[PDB]
Amino acid sequence: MDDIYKAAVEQLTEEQKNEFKAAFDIFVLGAEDGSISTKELGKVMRMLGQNPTPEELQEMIDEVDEDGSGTVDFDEFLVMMVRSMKDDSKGKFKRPTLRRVRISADAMMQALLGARAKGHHHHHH
Ligand SMILES: NCCCCCCCNS(=O)(=O)c1cccc2c(Cl)cccc12
Ligand SMILES: [Ca+2]
């Protein structure tokens, strides 16, 4: 993993970390290990309107999965959001060919939450 991405995770405030954490739980819905795999990835993408194949799903995870785990964990899913936002990739070129992902990770968060998530109520901080 990149040091910059790691800093981004730590940089995120309580709300930012909490928001991402919630996505992880939903993103890893049905995951035995709790990580986000192609099975969970495909389900999430399906909600967004995408229907990528298992092979494609694993590749996407590989983007944020440097440990070759094949699954996105808490630190990995957080980076994905950060990586998408920053996009340090700077487009390595390559034509649209039969591949091309421009999904908004930030937008995906809404799909993952799809709820006000007001279960917790705290006052008098
Ligand atoms: N300029 C291109 C920037 C892509 C940055 C890479 C993150 C986004 N890739 S993705 O296929 O849209 C995508 C969408 C939802 C979930 C994903 C997960 Cl859990 C893993 C990998 C990918 C995912
Ligand atoms: Ca991983």
Question: Brief description of this entry?
Answer:
The chain contains 6 helices and no strands. It is an all-alpha fold and 125 residues long.
Q: What are its keywords?
A:
125 residues; mainly alpha; 6 helices; globular; binds N-(7-aminoheptyl)-5-chloronaphthalene-1-sulfonamide; binds calcium ion; calcium-dependent protein binding; troponin T binding; protein homodimerization activity; repeat
Instruction: Give the proportion of residues in helices.
Output: 40-55%
Strand residues, percent? under 5%
- Major beta sheet, specifics? none
First-residue to last-residue Cα separation: 35 Å
Number of domains: 1
Please count the helical segments. Answer: 6
Radius of gyration: 15 Å
Structure summary, number of beta strands: 0
Structural class label: mainly alpha
H/E order of the elements? HHHHHH
Ligand inventory: N-(7-aminoheptyl)-5-chloronaphthalene-1-sulfonamide, calcium ion
